[PDB]
Amino acid sequence: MKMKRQEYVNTYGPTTGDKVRLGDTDLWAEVEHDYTVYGEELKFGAGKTIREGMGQSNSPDENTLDLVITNALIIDYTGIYKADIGIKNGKIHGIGKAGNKDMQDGVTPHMVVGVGTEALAGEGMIITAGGIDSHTHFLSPQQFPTALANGVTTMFGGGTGPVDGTNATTITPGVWNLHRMLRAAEEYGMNVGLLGKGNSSSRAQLVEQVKAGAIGFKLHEDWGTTPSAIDHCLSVADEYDVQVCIHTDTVNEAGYVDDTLRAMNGRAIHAYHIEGAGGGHSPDVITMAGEVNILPSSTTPTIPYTINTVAEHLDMLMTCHHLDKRIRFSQSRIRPGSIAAEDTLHDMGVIAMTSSDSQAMGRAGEVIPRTWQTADKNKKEFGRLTEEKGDNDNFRIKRYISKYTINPAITHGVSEYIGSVEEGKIADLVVWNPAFFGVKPKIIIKGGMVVFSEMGDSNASVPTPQPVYYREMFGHHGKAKFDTSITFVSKVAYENGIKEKLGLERKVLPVKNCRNVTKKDFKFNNTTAKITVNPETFEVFVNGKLCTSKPATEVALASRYTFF
Amino acid sequence: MKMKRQEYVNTYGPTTGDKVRLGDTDLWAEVEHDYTVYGEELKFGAGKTIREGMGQSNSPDENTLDLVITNALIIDYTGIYKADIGIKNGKIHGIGKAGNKDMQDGVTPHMVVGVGTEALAGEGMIITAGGIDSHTHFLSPQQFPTALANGVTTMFGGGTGPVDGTNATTITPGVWNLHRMLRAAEEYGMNVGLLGKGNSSSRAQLVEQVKAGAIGFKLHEDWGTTPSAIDHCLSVADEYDVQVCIHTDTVNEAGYVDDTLRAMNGRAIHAYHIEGAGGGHSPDVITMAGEVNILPSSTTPTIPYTINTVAEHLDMLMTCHHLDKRIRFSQSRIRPGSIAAEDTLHDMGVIAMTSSDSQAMGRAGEVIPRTWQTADKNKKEFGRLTEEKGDNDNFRIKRYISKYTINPAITHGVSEYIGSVEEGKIADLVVWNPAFFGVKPKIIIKGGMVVFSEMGDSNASVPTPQPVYYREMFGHHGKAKFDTSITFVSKVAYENGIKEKLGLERKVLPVKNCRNVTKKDFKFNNTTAKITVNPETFEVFVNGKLCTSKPATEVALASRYTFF
Amino acid sequence: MKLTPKEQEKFLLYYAGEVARKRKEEGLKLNQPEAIAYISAHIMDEARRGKKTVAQLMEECVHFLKKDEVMPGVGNMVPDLGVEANFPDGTKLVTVNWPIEPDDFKAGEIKFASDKDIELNAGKEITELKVTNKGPKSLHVGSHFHFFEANRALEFDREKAYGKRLDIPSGNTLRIGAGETKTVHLIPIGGSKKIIGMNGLLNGIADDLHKQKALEKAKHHGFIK
Amino acid sequence: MKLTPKEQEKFLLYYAGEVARKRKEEGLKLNQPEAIAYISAHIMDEARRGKKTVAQLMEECVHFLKKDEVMPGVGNMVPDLGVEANFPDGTKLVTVNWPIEPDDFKAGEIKFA
Ligand SMILES: [Fe+3]
Ligand SMILES: [Fe+3]
Ligand SMILES: [Fe+3]
Ligand SMILES: [Fe+3]
């Protein structure tokens, strides 16, 4: 039977060829393929499809799903398509067509909707992987709800709380502090991974930290990012398969950018705040982004480049670093050049990741909005990518989503567990209403359970009455949080029973394959170039051509959605 | 090189001979000594001291600190001096000069700043021990954040919750209720110790309670504080090395004050609200404070004596005790004499401790402010103490700080673990900004970790943006709270495995040396005298001289700091 | 509405600002939290109107409250104020230096023992040395960095800087601009002079015995030309 | 600001008082929680002005709301009210006996046998 196109879309969401506007941006996601059989679509409700002996099977099956996300529009590096998502044992069991092979055609064999299946209507919603924020300062436990409310499910970084060392660096230093923090982590719904102090010219002190559970090291200048410490840190990371993150020598005390790059010696390193305002060799830190071994990321305050970016920084630097009021400027000439370039470099796929720098020159609940604000800004400036095939922004979308999902996962050695909407991975997913895509999520699923969501009046006759605000769900509570949350550790710690030894009840998993990740390993952001900075004009150049962008006067996913 | 005095003080805080105004009071703390070597001071930051192979050692050491509090101004009974504080294994490892002996002169040998060391800038801050509130009514779990927000880290007392018995008395009665409360305690960041019902003329019922984990007993008139009860209770406390706290027979039913004192028989006892508005033999309970065996404390509502103290009480007594509106007065003639004397007795070192009486005729988050308000009031009325040496209030400061830190610790048998800023003790410390000293703390450290602090916007690019309010930190969460918090018990309970038997995950420590603490054992408040009350005028006399004070029309650490 | 935990915080801040405004209208001198909330609410209002820049607001809010509009000591208690607000271009941090005009009263006031200067690194032998930053970019060198191991862009008699550091306040840095020439004051490193790390030119005690080896490593690595 | 959990509570109480004031101005008869918040906010205001004593306020607030200004039974339901507020001399408890004038309606009334 023939169904009117408008009626189909209202009932089941968009199909092949339909274009969805992401929020209030000018980015259009086109449905590349639909895995359904028209007439066999699953709908939940009274007299609907998912019912005993109809859409829901009465035949027992080894693949009876625990949850079915019906008619989802997946947005992932793997593709922008329409499919039913099946969760089982807190993992993505299957992606395709769910239902009952007894009564329906074209059912994906391992996607059985049965007696034990829960239903979640994804018709007309966008489903994405949970974001990974690889630059977290563990300064305040209040960052976690803010992060979840913005689609972030995993946070890598360091800290002890609101102590000077943490206020400046992503470091949980030494055995005792690492043990304390890993035990503190039990409280939360957020997946965590801690970095120890990398700034050492002695092996013993670095090794102690990996064995204490660290997922890597952070080399920060406040602790001395000298070539000796760069070499010693990377040597230990190479031995123990852990990641290294870097905040370079801003003042050029022990050498220039090339001296730091030489110390690294082509070894894998996550270069934090690649632009330089967050810190690093003045004025040429950005030049590192061109190198194959350098895994670069951006922090939130500089992306997207706005008419207030420079003004905000010329004071935000003084509160964070605690500088004299006698100091006025240098940053007024250096900063515009690199902040403008940064946006372009993201669009070119030169900068592979987005991070926060939470409460230490950056915003906790801004990674996802700011990534899409930049994508939108660039689409508005540079136009539709030439890489696109059709009247859509799919390639650009895939490039940008990879920045906070898959690419941080690859960098930190957790790509096998999380990072993307793929069969076999842990079910850390975010459900979005297209009108609120990238700004306000609907449901946060972690380990196959809803952990956080937008919820109305607790007394109310339905879940919709006002005030609708973000609240913790069952998956975030009791002993169920131990089932839905992961504390990542090094292989050495994992293999030596850190879980048992520290009495951690959370899922403990090792980080692996950190050392041989280069730019080539990323998804949609594998671009290498010859990046240069004029030491007089501070202008950034990609392959001899000036790399710049215009500052935005207004941004998408902002003014329409927020009260304050 | 010659550094301008103002520039030195801005960079490192005050040095030897400098005077610091405590909050908005007229109390001046003079730096008695500085443990630094001028030019070798530790500073954390980019290009600063604490860096790899410089201020931070590259040489492994058995004494590598877990945390360094650089350039702190310690205010403690032990002295008012300038030093670096070193934390290791959640204990005060050392006090002196921290750093790297490889590159620096005059480093304290067991104060090594290394790879595993976290930094906390104490330059220009006052560091004090965490306060001990020995008069807690466990009424509401909401008292705990209020207490921490006011620099209190340990709470002794009793209760079951919002029930009449607790509402009135600090008593967790019997085995079952004690077990239940000790298990409820697991939730919190606060150190706890519970008192059972001392009002018994039978041994068995008292013994059961000590064996159930009680740190002592509370004899309260609501359960009848008769001479028989007083003797039986102290006899058991003497056998089991536990403390006894007392609210005496207000209505002199079984005898007068001298009859109660006789029943005690020179045995150690903690006399709550010694002034008598909070309860006790009318009108002479204050006369007990002169006795050597009596360890006296004050409750917050009567200290300092203000123009609204009497008016507030002649009604606050009617809501707490639930009295008929037919009852008008006696308290109007008795009360001014004793409330006025109370302030002077504190200044004289006659009353050794200050407590709260929390939600049961006293305020939870007022112990610390009210102690300093009284110190300030007296200084303003009676002038600088004759005991002072130099243009400072150091002796008065030491006398007052001891009231809520060391003296409660000595009384309750926990002076070996907590109560003062001393090497070997548990790292329960409070960081204060001098402009907010005694009214609003900055950071609360418990067991070497930050548990509570003033924190700004969770989304914010730095930790300073508004609204800045008190929040729980990592040390207060997960399994880290079990590492940073102590549940004190009796030796009998401790030695009989109460921890294992009740499945308590918190640090369980026994109270010891309660029975042989007299007035002589206190710090700066060892004063004994012949205290008499005129039964006609209600005037208080110390060795025949009228003991009084004028009521305050305004107090320090109040109006300037609070919204409501 | 989908109110984020940060939006819930801002409501309290804004309400506190509204209460403070009411009290000022009553003619009351505002206290520390009232003054902060009053200025914060103004910033939040102007940001919503989206007609002023962050730069404009930072300037506009200096002495937004005058000394007689607040209680004594309030201005000195609040030397700077920070408030994040959503502008048409997104959330931006508004940093105000001296939002409240100060007076003669200072809570937490420090009174010096003497106005006399503090002699840092007393008794250490000063070595005067001419240094030139021959590099294209400016650089800084910290108080405790082994001067001998400084960026190879710096041109000086390295032999004379062996086992020494800058005679400057602990934690301070000395700037040498691109092309700039300066006379530095060096003092011998404290403690044992066990120099481990930085550029790895020494990695041991800075004695006479290690000196030739260190000078050879410095030359080989390009520090000594 | 350094807002203590007790200061956060007082903002809610004060806002509830402000909403109650608005409703009274609209000519609505206040209910049990509205009446309590209306009187509480008055006490909090007078304390900040720091011109009245606790003794003065305890007296001033008796029948602060009249029987016709509130719904029936409201006065009987609130026989006493307590509100802690910061005065120039510190935080003090303001205890009001019969803050709302009673009417002959009594919710939860006990009628003797
Ligand atoms: Fe950084
Ligand atoms: Fe950072
Ligand atoms: Fe009592
Ligand atoms: Fe009591």
Automatic annotation (TrEMBL), chains A, B:
Carboxylation allows a single lysine to coordinate two nickel ions. Carbamylation allows a single lysine to coordinate two nickel ions. It holds the Pfam family Amidohydro_1. It comes from the Bacteria. Substrate binds at H220. GO terms for biological process: urea catabolic process. The active site is at H321. PANTHER family: UREASE (PTHR43440:SF1). This is Urease subunit beta. It comes from Helicobacter mustelae (strain ATCC 43772 / CCUG 25715 / CIP 103759 / LMG 18044 / NCTC 12198 / R85-136P) (Campylobacter mustelae).
UniProtKB/TrEMBL annotation, chain C:
One of its GO terms (biological process) is urea catabolic process. It catalyses: urea + 2 H2O + H(+) = hydrogencarbonate + 2 NH4(+). It comes from the Bacteria. One of its GO terms (molecular function) is identical protein binding. It is an enzyme of class 3 (hydrolase). Pfam families: Urease_beta (PF00699), Urease_gamma (PF00547). SUPFAM superfamilies: Urease, beta-subunit (SSF51278), Urease, gamma-subunit (SSF54111). InterPro entries: Urease_beta-like (IPR002019), Urease_betasu_sf (IPR036461), Urease_gamma-beta_su (IPR008223), Urease_gamma/gamma-beta_su (IPR002026), Urease_gamma_sf (IPR036463), Urease_subunit (IPR050069). This is urease. It comes from Helicobacter mustelae (strain ATCC 43772 / CCUG 25715 / CIP 103759 / LMG 18044 / NCTC 12198 / R85-136P). The gene is ureA2.
